[PDB]
Every structure is written in structure tokens, then in C-alpha cells.
Amino acid sequence: SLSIVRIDAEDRWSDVVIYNNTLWYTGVPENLDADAFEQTANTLAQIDAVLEKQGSSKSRILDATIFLSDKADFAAMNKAWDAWVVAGHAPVRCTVQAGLMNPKYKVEIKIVAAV
Amino acid sequence: SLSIVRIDAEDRWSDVVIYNNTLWYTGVPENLDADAFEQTANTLAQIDAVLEKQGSSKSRILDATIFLSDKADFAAMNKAWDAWVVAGHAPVRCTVQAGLMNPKYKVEIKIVAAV
Amino acid sequence: SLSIVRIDAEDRWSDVVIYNNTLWYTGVPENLDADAFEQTANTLAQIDAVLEKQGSSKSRILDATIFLSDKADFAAMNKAWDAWVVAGHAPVRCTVQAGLMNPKYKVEIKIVAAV
């Protein structure tokens, strides 16, 4: 559909937007003092739950942009990603180090997925 | 339409691109000597201008990635965003810090919207 | 089509994703010891190859985001872009400097295109 659907949840930093059978969402860490692996692993779990609640799923992710605050955390974030990603159904994947909006975020994950 | 429409199509870039009922655009500030907050507001206003010319609006933006040159300007670009954004019609957002091309850029905003 | 097609679908990533008449891809350099001009020119050549394998072309690219590891490489990557881009058929473009996963990468290029 060409009618935009927007979804706000109290426990969730980003809205979800659905349009033209496509879904956008940004995953942000919930446990600020946690390390990069935890934040990546738990943000990937957040994303699954958000996609499922709107019928989609981690199998239907088209493109993912992982922003990291520190180059030292690449290994940890690959380790989480690699434990979660669906073999043969993986999204196109962008990973860049950049400054994040909260100094305690080690990771932030933009998602575009099919609905 | 599955036909691609380009606005201000030059030799090396286009300013706006429209395809499959979706519009792409990067906004850059024109007020290059102003501060972050005021460069942001200016960018946002150009975006409104661009979206209105094609039939859309700031109520129909799907995703927005805000690049800041300096980590110290997060709070200020948020201030300019909250004055501009339409509550309950907000797009998904990304704000990160990276190097911009013109050294007088505090901010640069990439936009995907519906049309 | 509302079906998801993945090209070179691997364990942790897919090289290309195609959905809803839209194609997503991220080009990364092949020659790690090459300078930024070679890496950019070469990456634009890969993008073409990827687009035409799917029956699309570089005239059909909608949006491009170029990440450079070093601000000193801006001129080298514009020279490559300028030698390649299709006058009057260029996408929205956006260049920023950021940290990249491999320290030998001077450039990386994400592409959304019509297919």
C-alpha cells in the first residue's frame, strides 16, 4: 500500500514506518553500561521482535546499516551478527564507525525490510 | 511509476529523484556561516520546499539520516528537528557524526519520502 | 515483485538484494593497495557489472552514498565519479568521511537502484 503506517511504542526509541510494502526501523541499545557484543546482540533481538509484531521477520531484511562508535568494537559486533544472521537469507550489510547520539551507545542498526 | 523522474538533473548529480512512489533527496544548508541549530532549520526548510513542489510534505517522510560534523551539536540539531517535525507523523531517524565535504557544513540531511 | 531475490547469498551476507523493483548493493574495493582513485573507479565498474547482470544499468541508479576513510581523498573520488557518471541521469549523491571496516579501504559505495 501507498498509505503510510506509523507505529510508536513507549519502550522503544524509534518509530516503525511501513510504506509500499517496505519497513524502516532503527535499533538502539537499551542497556547503556553494557559492552558492544551485548548491545549488538540485544539490538538484533529487539529488531526481530519489532519485525514479527508487524508480521515481517529477520529473514525478510533487505539492507542493514550498522554504525559503530569505535573501531575496537568491530569484532564483537561481527560476533553477535554472526550468531543471529540467517544463512542464505542475509541482508545487504553496511558497517561504518561514526559518532553516535549517546556517548554510551556502542552500536546502532538501521533496517529496511520487506512486509 | 516504474519510470524514473529526476529534478534538476545536471552532469554530475541530480537534486531530487522520484521512482516507485518514493522520493530521494539530500539537503545541505545554504547559510554556511550560521550555527548548527540554524543550519539544520535551514536544511529542513529546503526539504519542505522540495517535498511541496512534488506534491508531498513533511508529513510523508519515511526515513531521515542526519550527518553532523561535530559531536557537540547533537542537542542543537535535535532542538531544530523538534520545532520542525509533525508529531505523530514523524519519520524514522538517524543522527550520527561524520566528516562533511564542505568545511563550513555543520549538518547534512538525507531523506527518503513518499509521493 | 514482492518476492525477495538475493544474489550471491552467503552465510553472513548477500551481495545484492532485489525487492519491489528496487535493488540494494554496497560496493567495496578489490585492490587493497590501490589509491582512492583506483578504488573508486574500480568500485563504480563493479556496480555497473552488478546492475547489468540484473538487466539494470548505471542510468537507473536512484541514490548513492560514498563513504571515504580520509577527507584528503575527496578529489580523487570525484575525479573517478566524474569520469563515470551519466550526464542527465545521475542519482542523488552524498559523500561523507567515516571509519571503514578494512583499514586498506579508501572508499565504499552504497547504491539503491531501479530494476
Contact list in A for residue C19 (CB cut-off 8 A) is 22, 62, 114
CB C25 within 8 A of CB C70: no
CB atoms within 10 A of CB A77: 23
Provide the angle, in degrees to the nearest 10, between the axes of the packed helices A74-84 and A36-53: 40
Instruction: Please name the residue that has the C-alpha cell 519515511.
Output: B62
DSSP C51: H
What residues contact A8, with CB distance under 8 A and at least 6 apart?
A15, B88
Chain B residues lying within 8 Å of C113, measured CB to CB? none
- Name residue B107's amino acid: V
**Tally of helices (H runs) and strands (E runs) in chain C:** 2, 7
Q: How far is C51 from chain B (nearest CA, A)?
A: 16
Residue A9 lies in domain: 1-115
Cα C91 from Cα C64, distance rounded (Å) = 7
User: In this structure, are residues C27 and C106 in contact, taking their beta carbons and an 8 Å threshold?
Assistant: no
Q: Which three three-digit cell numbers place residue B53?
A: 513542489
CA distance B114 to A91: 23
Q: Do B19 and C85 touch (CB under 8 A)?
A: no
Q: Is A31 buried (19+), middle (13-18) or exposed (0-12) by CB count in 10 A?
A: exposed
Which approach determined this entry?
X-ray
Dihedral (Cα; A30, A32, A37, A43), 10-degree rounding: 20
Q: Which of B4, B12, B16 sits opposite C82 (nearest CB)?
A: B12
Residue A51 parent element (H or E): helix A36-53
For chain B, what is the domain count? 1
Q: Do A91 and C17 meet the contact criterion of CB atoms below 8 Å apart?
A: yes
Q: Say if CB C115 and CB C19 are below 8 A apart.
A: no
**B5 vs chain C: nearest CA distance in angstroms?**
9
Q: What is the number of other CB atoms lying within 10 angstroms of the CB of residue B85?
A: 17
Whether B10 has its CB under 8 Å from any CB of chain C: the answer is yes
Domain CATH for B88: 3.30.1330.40
Nearest CB among A60, A91, A96 relative to C98 is that of A96
- In whole angstroms, what is the distance from residue C108 CA to residue A93 CA? 12
What does each C-alpha distance from B55 to B23, B84, B92 come to in angstroms? 11, 19, 21
Which chain C residue has the Cα nearest residue A22?
A: C20
Decide if B62 contacts A17 (C-beta within 8 A): yes
Q: Phi, psi at residue C37, to the nearest 5°?
A: -65, -50
CB pairs under 8 A between A and C: 71
Report the DSSP pairing between strands C92-97 and C61-68: parallel
Chain B residues with beta carbon closer than 8 angstroms to that of A99: 68, 71, 96-98
Number of residues written out for chain A: 115
Interface test with A, best of C2, C19, C65 (most A CBs within 10 A): C19
A91, three cell numbers: 541482508
C19-46: b (≥16 Cβ within 10 Å) or e: bbebbbbbbbbeeeebebbbbbbbbbeb
Q: At what angle do helices B74-84 and B36-53 cross, to 10 degrees?
A: 40
The alpha carbon torsion through A12, A17, A22, A24 (nearest 10 deg) reads -50
Please say whether the beta carbons of B104 and B33 come within 8 A: yes
CB contact under 8 A, B92 and A25: yes
Cβ <8 Å between C98 and A95: no
3-state secondary structure of B14: strand
Beta-strand pair A5-7/B61-68: unpaired
Helix (H) or strand (E) holding A53: helix A36-53
Report the Cα A34 to chain-centroid distance in Å.
Answer: 17
Is A84 within 8 Å of C11 (Cβ atoms)? no
Here the cell at position B86 is 509533525
B26 to C96: CB separation less than 8 angstroms, yes or no: no
To test the contact with chain B by mutation, choose from C94, C100, C107, C115 the residue with the greatest count of B C-beta atoms within 10 A, namely C94
Q: What is the DSSP string of B21-76?
A: TEEEEEE--S-TTS-HHHHHHHHHHHHHHHHHHTT--TTSEEEEEEEES-GGGHHH
